[PDB]
DNA sequence: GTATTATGTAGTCTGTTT
DNA sequence: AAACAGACTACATAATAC
């Protein structure tokens, strides 16, 4: 299913602060891209970050 | 046997430039730390960098 | 060495959800 | 309204690159 920032971030190698995934996400490193939904960010259960 | 620094960094899941690797062994951030031999690093295999 | 990139915390801004 | 989520910027330091 998909997950929210925090919860994609906590099952990363390397949790970041909430603000740093939100800048990935602004520079187009996270694949696929989140969609927001309303407010929030939903990412895919299989979303990697990727470098550009 | 040893492996060479570059042998290693490729090894590892995100290989890093040489510089930095270089800079980590001088940090005594490798365990165990790999022997200068002559003018390069020889690395054990099970070598690994500690946060 | 110096420069650039990556990250962190805060305040203020737009907008969403209750 | 009030809490939430995130954008954007100002301000920092650290790690990495040059």
């Given at each position: 299913?998909?997950?929210?920032?925090?919860?994609?971030?906590?099952?990363?190698?390397?949790?970041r602060?909430?603000?740093?995934?939100?800048?990935?996400?602004?520079?187009?490193?996270?694949?696929?891209?989140?969609?927001?939904?309303?407010?929030?960010?939903?990412?895919?259960?299989?979303?990697?970050?990727?470098?550009?």
């Open positions: 299913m998909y997950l929210t920032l925090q919860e994609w971030n906590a099952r990363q190698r390397r949790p602060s909430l603000e740093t995934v939100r800048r990935w996400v602004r520079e187009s490193r996270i694949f696929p891209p989140p969609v927001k939904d309303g407010r929030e960010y939903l990412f895919h259960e299989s979303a990697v970050k990727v470098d550009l």
